[PDB]
Amino acid sequence: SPLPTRRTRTFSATVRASQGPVYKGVCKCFCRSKGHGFITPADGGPDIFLHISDVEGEYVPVEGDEVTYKMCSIKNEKLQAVEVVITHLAPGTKHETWS
Amino acid sequence: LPTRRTRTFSATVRASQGPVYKGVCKCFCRSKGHGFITPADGGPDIFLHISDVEGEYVPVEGDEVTYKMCSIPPKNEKLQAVEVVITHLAPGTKHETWS
Amino acid sequence: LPTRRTRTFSATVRASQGPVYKGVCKCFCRSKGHGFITPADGGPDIFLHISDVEGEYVPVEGDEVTYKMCSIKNEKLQAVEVVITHLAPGTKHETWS
Amino acid sequence: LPTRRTRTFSATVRASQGPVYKGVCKCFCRSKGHGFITPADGGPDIFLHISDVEGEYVPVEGDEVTYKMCSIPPNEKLQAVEVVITHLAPGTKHETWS
């Protein structure tokens, strides 16, 4: 897919997203050097695509990290997460900040 | 003075969990990377950093915005706008994109 | 000596709007109406005034706590919106009455 | 009836643990030590005891506020705790305790 960054979300796309509900989920995947990953919804579902630009906080996300996010459709059905916050850090792994 | 990938784990957390406010962009210099939002309901203006702004448009004086609030540790001496969305375009200035 | 009905408008908003820290009640003399909290994560102790304590229990050395912070007119730190999360095992705990 | 000194240990934790809401001071009578907050989302006015107010100002109708929520035990009825005046109501005069 043409990568839907946060500096790229259309005006309305962004406003609609921000007005939706807040979801809980877990970080399944994330490659810092690629700029993306996925998030396994809580309340079960297809994994939501995750772009590095939509991430919030000093920390780089890691598999098993708990997250809250809003959804934003991409121009088909695919789903993206926006306004993404790490709620719980996964114990055991090393957690790293950007920089 | 802090940015998105700089904002401590929990500041990010508690901000995201707070209420949403409406304001108006009062300042913003892209060269410099910050501006100010005067809250609707008047009062003190809130500091605003470019990395905390979502969507494709660059904020401009007069833009309506929803945002969340959050303070600047360890001392919480000043407030800051986070999760900041342009909701209504300042009707008279012509607008650009980060591109 | 800032207290809750004395904290200025901006300080209150600004504290209420910062992170939530964990710590431990280092001491508390009720008759004096204050004490200290020690930050979890190490750091300088935090002034703790009685008016900022929320709940039926008087605080005791060892009580686990959460709080918001607020620099005091340069800066000392005060703890605000202060919650006892676990009671101190050794000691006996009183109520405010 | 419950106050910030009367609030059970347990109640206090959950209250603080829960979400933060926005609202507006519906009323408040300092003489009586209580008023109401109209929730912004929408819904029933939240009871508000004086003890739970932080800051130097006595609350005024139209003051805009954040707060966490609490339930009054036998529950049902709700209450507001950790109550911050985020925005001063512009029209009237604003006072302070004392």
Coordinates of C-alpha atoms in Angstrom, one line a residue:
Chain A
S1 CA 0.0 0.0 0.0
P2 CA 1.0 3.6 -0.5
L3 CA 2.0 4.4 3.1
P4 CA -0.6 6.6 4.8
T5 CA 1.6 8.7 7.1
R6 CA 0.2 11.2 9.6
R7 CA 1.5 14.2 7.6
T8 CA -0.5 12.7 4.8
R9 CA -3.8 11.9 6.3
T10 CA -6.4 14.0 4.4
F11 CA -8.1 16.7 6.3
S12 CA -11.4 14.8 6.6
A13 CA -9.7 11.4 7.1
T14 CA -8.0 12.9 10.1
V15 CA -11.1 14.6 11.6
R16 CA -13.3 11.5 11.2
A17 CA -10.6 9.3 12.8
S18 CA -10.3 11.7 15.8
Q19 CA -14.1 11.6 16.3
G20 CA -14.4 7.8 16.4
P21 CA -14.1 5.8 19.7
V22 CA -10.9 4.7 21.4
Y23 CA -9.9 1.1 21.0
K24 CA -7.6 -1.1 23.1
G25 CA -5.1 -3.4 21.4
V26 CA -1.7 -5.0 21.4
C27 CA 1.4 -4.4 19.3
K28 CA 1.9 -7.6 17.2
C29 CA 4.8 -6.3 15.0
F30 CA 7.0 -3.2 14.6
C31 CA 10.2 -2.6 12.6
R32 CA 11.7 0.8 13.4
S33 CA 13.8 0.6 10.2
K34 CA 10.7 -0.1 8.1
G35 CA 8.5 2.5 9.8
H36 CA 5.5 0.2 10.4
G37 CA 3.9 -2.7 12.2
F38 CA 0.6 -4.1 13.1
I39 CA -1.7 -4.1 16.1
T40 CA -3.9 -7.0 17.3
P41 CA -7.2 -5.5 18.4
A42 CA -8.5 -6.5 21.8
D43 CA -12.0 -7.6 21.2
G44 CA -10.5 -9.8 18.5
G45 CA -10.0 -8.9 14.8
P46 CA -7.9 -8.4 11.7
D47 CA -4.6 -6.7 12.6
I48 CA -4.6 -2.9 12.2
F49 CA -1.8 -1.5 10.1
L50 CA 0.5 0.9 12.1
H51 CA 2.8 3.6 10.8
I52 CA 5.7 5.0 12.8
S53 CA 4.4 8.5 12.4
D54 CA 1.1 7.8 14.3
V55 CA 3.0 6.7 17.4
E56 CA 3.1 8.8 20.5
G57 CA 5.6 8.9 23.3
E58 CA 9.3 8.6 23.8
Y59 CA 9.3 4.8 23.4
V60 CA 9.7 2.5 20.4
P61 CA 6.9 0.0 20.3
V62 CA 7.7 -3.7 20.9
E63 CA 5.7 -6.9 20.5
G64 CA 3.4 -7.4 23.4
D65 CA 3.1 -3.7 24.1
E66 CA -0.4 -2.6 25.1
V67 CA -1.9 0.3 23.1
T68 CA -4.9 2.5 22.7
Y69 CA -5.6 3.9 19.3
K70 CA -8.2 5.3 17.0
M71 CA -9.0 3.8 13.6
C72 CA -8.8 5.5 10.2
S73 CA -9.8 3.8 6.9
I74 CA -7.3 4.0 4.1
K75 CA -8.7 4.4 -0.7
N76 CA -10.3 1.0 0.1
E77 CA -11.2 -0.9 3.2
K78 CA -7.8 -1.5 4.8
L79 CA -7.5 -0.1 8.4
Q80 CA -4.9 2.0 10.0
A81 CA -4.3 3.1 13.6
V82 CA -3.9 6.8 14.5
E83 CA -3.3 8.7 17.7
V84 CA -1.5 5.7 19.1
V85 CA -0.5 5.5 22.7
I86 CA 1.5 2.8 24.6
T87 CA -0.4 2.0 27.8
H88 CA 1.6 -1.0 29.1
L89 CA 5.2 -2.0 28.5
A90 CA 5.8 -5.7 27.9
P91 CA 7.9 -7.1 30.7
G92 CA 11.1 -9.1 29.8
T93 CA 12.0 -7.3 26.6
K94 CA 14.3 -4.3 26.4
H95 CA 12.3 -1.2 25.7
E96 CA 14.0 1.6 23.9
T97 CA 13.3 5.2 23.2
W98 CA 13.8 7.0 19.9
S99 CA 17.4 8.5 19.9
Chain B
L1 CA 11.1 22.0 25.8
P2 CA 9.5 18.7 24.5
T3 CA 8.2 17.0 21.4
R4 CA 6.2 13.8 20.5
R5 CA 9.1 11.4 20.5
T6 CA 10.4 13.1 23.6
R7 CA 7.3 13.2 25.8
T8 CA 7.8 10.9 28.8
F9 CA 5.9 7.6 28.8
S10 CA 3.3 8.7 31.4
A11 CA 2.8 12.3 30.3
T12 CA 1.8 10.8 27.0
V13 CA -0.4 8.4 28.9
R14 CA -2.3 10.8 31.0
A15 CA -2.7 13.3 28.2
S16 CA -4.3 10.8 25.9
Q17 CA -6.7 9.8 28.6
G18 CA -7.9 13.4 29.3
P19 CA -10.8 15.4 27.9
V20 CA -10.8 17.1 24.5
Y21 CA -10.8 20.8 24.1
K22 CA -11.5 23.2 21.4
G23 CA -9.2 26.1 20.6
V24 CA -8.0 28.4 17.9
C25 CA -4.4 28.5 16.6
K26 CA -3.0 32.0 17.4
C27 CA 0.6 31.6 16.3
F28 CA 2.7 29.2 14.3
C29 CA 6.0 29.5 12.6
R30 CA 7.1 26.5 10.6
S31 CA 10.6 27.7 10.3
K32 CA 10.7 27.5 14.1
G33 CA 8.4 24.6 14.7
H34 CA 6.0 26.0 17.3
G35 CA 3.0 28.2 17.7
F36 CA 0.3 28.8 20.3
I37 CA -3.4 28.0 20.7
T38 CA -5.7 30.3 22.4
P39 CA -8.2 28.1 24.1
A40 CA -11.8 28.7 23.3
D41 CA -13.2 29.8 26.7
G42 CA -10.4 32.3 26.6
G43 CA -7.6 32.1 29.1
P44 CA -3.9 31.5 28.7
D45 CA -2.6 30.3 25.3
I46 CA -1.2 26.8 25.2
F47 CA 2.3 26.1 23.7
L48 CA 2.1 24.0 20.6
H49 CA 4.9 22.0 18.9
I50 CA 4.9 20.9 15.2
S51 CA 5.3 17.2 15.9
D52 CA 2.1 17.1 17.9
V53 CA 0.0 18.2 14.9
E54 CA -1.7 15.7 12.8
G55 CA -3.0 15.7 9.2
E56 CA -1.6 17.2 6.0
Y57 CA -2.2 20.9 6.6
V58 CA 0.2 23.2 8.4
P59 CA -1.6 25.1 11.2
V60 CA -2.3 28.8 10.5
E61 CA -3.5 31.7 12.6
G62 CA -7.3 31.3 12.7
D63 CA -7.5 27.5 12.3
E64 CA -10.0 25.9 14.6
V65 CA -8.6 22.9 16.5
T66 CA -9.4 20.2 19.0
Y67 CA -6.5 19.2 21.3
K68 CA -5.7 17.6 24.5
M69 CA -3.7 19.2 27.3
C70 CA -0.5 18.1 29.1
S71 CA 2.3 19.6 31.3
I72 CA 6.0 19.9 31.1
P73 CA 7.9 17.9 33.9
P74 CA 9.4 17.3 36.2
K75 CA 8.1 20.7 37.3
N76 CA 5.0 21.0 35.3
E77 CA 5.7 24.7 34.9
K78 CA 4.0 25.2 31.5
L79 CA 1.1 23.6 29.6
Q80 CA 1.2 22.1 26.1
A81 CA -1.3 21.0 23.4
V82 CA -1.1 17.4 22.3
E83 CA -3.2 15.3 20.0
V84 CA -4.0 18.4 18.0
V85 CA -6.4 18.4 15.1
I86 CA -7.4 21.2 12.7
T87 CA -11.2 21.0 12.7
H88 CA -12.1 24.2 10.7
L89 CA -9.7 25.9 8.3
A90 CA -9.1 29.7 9.0
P91 CA -11.4 31.0 6.3
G92 CA -9.3 33.6 4.8
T93 CA -5.7 32.8 4.5
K94 CA -5.0 30.1 2.0
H95 CA -3.4 26.9 3.2
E96 CA -0.4 24.7 2.5
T97 CA 0.8 21.2 3.2
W98 CA 4.0 19.9 4.7
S99 CA 4.9 18.7 1.2
Chain C
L1 CA 3.4 27.0 52.6
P2 CA 1.0 26.2 49.8
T3 CA -2.2 24.2 50.5
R4 CA -5.2 23.3 48.4
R5 CA -7.3 26.4 48.9
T6 CA -4.3 28.5 48.5
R7 CA -2.8 27.0 45.5
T8 CA -3.1 29.5 42.7
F9 CA -5.3 28.9 39.8
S10 CA -2.6 28.0 37.2
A11 CA -0.6 25.7 39.5
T12 CA -3.7 23.6 40.2
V13 CA -4.5 23.3 36.5
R14 CA -0.8 22.6 35.7
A15 CA -0.4 19.9 38.4
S16 CA -3.8 18.3 37.6
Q17 CA -2.5 18.0 34.0
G18 CA 0.9 16.4 34.6
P19 CA 2.0 12.7 35.0
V20 CA 1.0 10.5 37.9
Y21 CA 3.9 9.5 40.0
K22 CA 4.3 6.7 42.6
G23 CA 6.0 7.2 45.9
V24 CA 6.1 6.3 49.6
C25 CA 5.1 8.3 52.6
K26 CA 8.4 9.1 54.2
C27 CA 6.7 10.8 57.2
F28 CA 3.6 12.7 58.3
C29 CA 2.9 14.6 61.5
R30 CA -0.8 15.3 61.5
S31 CA -0.7 18.0 64.3
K32 CA 1.8 19.9 62.1
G33 CA -0.3 19.1 59.0
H34 CA 2.4 17.8 56.6
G35 CA 5.2 15.4 55.8
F36 CA 7.1 14.1 52.9
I37 CA 6.8 11.6 50.1
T38 CA 9.8 9.7 48.6
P39 CA 9.5 9.3 44.8
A40 CA 9.5 5.8 43.5
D41 CA 12.3 5.9 40.9
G42 CA 14.5 7.8 43.4
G43 CA 14.8 11.6 43.6
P44 CA 14.4 14.6 45.9
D45 CA 11.7 14.2 48.6
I46 CA 8.3 15.9 48.0
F47 CA 6.6 18.3 50.3
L48 CA 3.2 17.0 51.3
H49 CA 0.6 19.2 53.0
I50 CA -2.4 17.7 54.8
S51 CA -5.0 19.4 52.6
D52 CA -3.9 17.6 49.5
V53 CA -4.5 14.1 50.9
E54 CA -7.6 12.3 49.5
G55 CA -9.4 9.7 51.6
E56 CA -10.6 8.5 55.1
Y57 CA -7.1 7.4 56.3
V58 CA -4.3 9.5 57.9
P59 CA -1.0 8.7 56.2
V60 CA 1.7 6.8 57.7
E61 CA 5.4 6.1 57.1
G62 CA 5.4 3.4 54.5
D63 CA 2.1 4.1 52.8
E64 CA 2.3 3.6 49.0
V65 CA 1.0 6.6 47.1
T66 CA 0.2 8.2 43.8
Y67 CA 0.4 11.9 43.3
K68 CA 0.7 14.8 40.9
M69 CA 3.6 17.3 41.3
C70 CA 3.6 21.1 41.5
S71 CA 6.7 23.4 41.8
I72 CA 6.2 26.0 44.5
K73 CA 8.4 31.6 44.3
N74 CA 11.0 29.7 42.5
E75 CA 10.7 26.1 43.0
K76 CA 10.3 23.5 45.6
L77 CA 8.1 20.6 44.8
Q78 CA 4.8 19.8 46.2
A79 CA 2.7 16.7 46.0
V80 CA -1.0 17.1 45.1
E81 CA -4.1 14.9 44.5
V82 CA -2.5 12.3 46.7
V83 CA -3.8 8.8 46.9
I84 CA -2.9 6.0 49.4
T85 CA -2.7 2.8 47.3
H86 CA -1.4 0.4 49.8
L87 CA -1.4 0.8 53.6
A88 CA 1.8 0.3 55.6
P89 CA 1.9 -3.3 56.9
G90 CA 3.7 -2.7 60.2
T91 CA 1.8 0.3 61.5
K92 CA -1.8 0.9 62.7
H93 CA -3.9 3.1 60.5
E94 CA -6.3 5.8 61.8
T95 CA -9.2 7.6 60.1
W96 CA -9.5 11.4 60.1
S97 CA -12.2 11.4 62.8
Chain D
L1 CA -23.1 12.9 51.8
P2 CA -19.6 11.5 51.5
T3 CA -16.6 13.8 51.7
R4 CA -12.9 13.6 50.8
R5 CA -12.1 12.7 54.4
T6 CA -15.0 10.4 54.7
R7 CA -14.5 8.6 51.3
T8 CA -13.7 4.9 51.9
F9 CA -10.2 3.8 51.1
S10 CA -11.4 1.6 48.3
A11 CA -13.7 4.1 46.7
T12 CA -10.9 6.6 46.6
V13 CA -8.6 4.3 44.6
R14 CA -11.1 3.5 41.9
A15 CA -12.2 7.1 41.6
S16 CA -8.6 8.1 41.0
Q17 CA -8.0 5.1 38.8
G18 CA -10.9 5.9 36.4
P19 CA -11.2 8.3 33.4
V20 CA -11.1 12.1 33.5
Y21 CA -14.2 14.0 32.4
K22 CA -14.9 17.6 31.3
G23 CA -17.9 19.5 32.7
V24 CA -19.3 22.8 33.8
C25 CA -20.3 24.1 37.3
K26 CA -24.1 23.9 37.2
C27 CA -24.3 25.4 40.7
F28 CA -22.5 25.8 43.9
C29 CA -23.4 27.3 47.2
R30 CA -20.4 27.9 49.4
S31 CA -22.6 28.5 52.4
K32 CA -24.1 25.0 51.8
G33 CA -20.8 23.4 50.8
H34 CA -22.0 21.8 47.5
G35 CA -23.3 22.3 44.0
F36 CA -23.6 20.4 40.8
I37 CA -21.6 19.8 37.7
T38 CA -23.2 19.3 34.3
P39 CA -21.3 16.6 32.4
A40 CA -20.1 17.7 29.0
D41 CA -20.6 14.5 27.4
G42 CA -24.2 14.6 28.4
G43 CA -26.2 13.1 31.2
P44 CA -27.2 13.6 34.8
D45 CA -25.7 16.4 36.8
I46 CA -22.9 15.1 39.0
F47 CA -23.0 15.9 42.7
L48 CA -20.1 18.0 44.0
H49 CA -19.0 18.5 47.6
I50 CA -16.9 21.4 48.6
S51 CA -14.1 19.2 50.1
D52 CA -13.3 17.8 46.6
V53 CA -12.5 21.2 45.1
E54 CA -8.9 22.1 44.5
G55 CA -7.5 25.6 44.0
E56 CA -8.0 29.0 45.5
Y57 CA -11.3 29.8 43.8
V58 CA -14.9 29.1 45.0
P59 CA -16.7 27.5 42.0
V60 CA -19.0 29.6 39.9
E61 CA -21.8 28.7 37.5
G62 CA -20.1 28.3 34.1
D63 CA -16.7 27.6 35.5
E64 CA -15.3 24.8 33.3
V65 CA -14.1 21.8 35.1
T66 CA -12.2 18.5 34.9
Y67 CA -13.0 15.8 37.4
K68 CA -12.9 12.1 38.1
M69 CA -16.1 10.2 39.0
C70 CA -17.3 8.4 42.1
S71 CA -20.4 6.5 43.2
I72 CA -22.3 7.1 46.4
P73 CA -22.6 3.9 48.3
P74 CA -25.7 2.1 49.8
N75 CA -24.7 3.3 44.5
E76 CA -26.5 4.7 41.5
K77 CA -26.0 8.4 42.1
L78 CA -22.6 9.7 41.0
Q79 CA -20.1 12.2 42.5
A80 CA -17.2 14.3 41.3
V81 CA -13.8 14.0 42.9
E82 CA -10.4 15.7 42.2
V83 CA -12.2 18.7 40.8
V84 CA -10.3 21.2 38.8
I85 CA -11.4 24.6 37.5
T86 CA -9.8 24.5 34.0
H87 CA -11.5 27.7 32.7
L88 CA -12.9 30.7 34.6
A89 CA -16.4 31.7 33.8
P90 CA -16.1 35.2 32.1
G91 CA -19.2 37.1 33.1
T92 CA -19.4 37.1 36.9
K93 CA -17.0 38.1 39.7
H94 CA -14.6 35.4 40.9
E95 CA -13.8 35.0 44.5
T96 CA -11.5 32.9 46.7
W97 CA -12.0 31.1 50.0
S98 CA -11.7 33.7 52.8

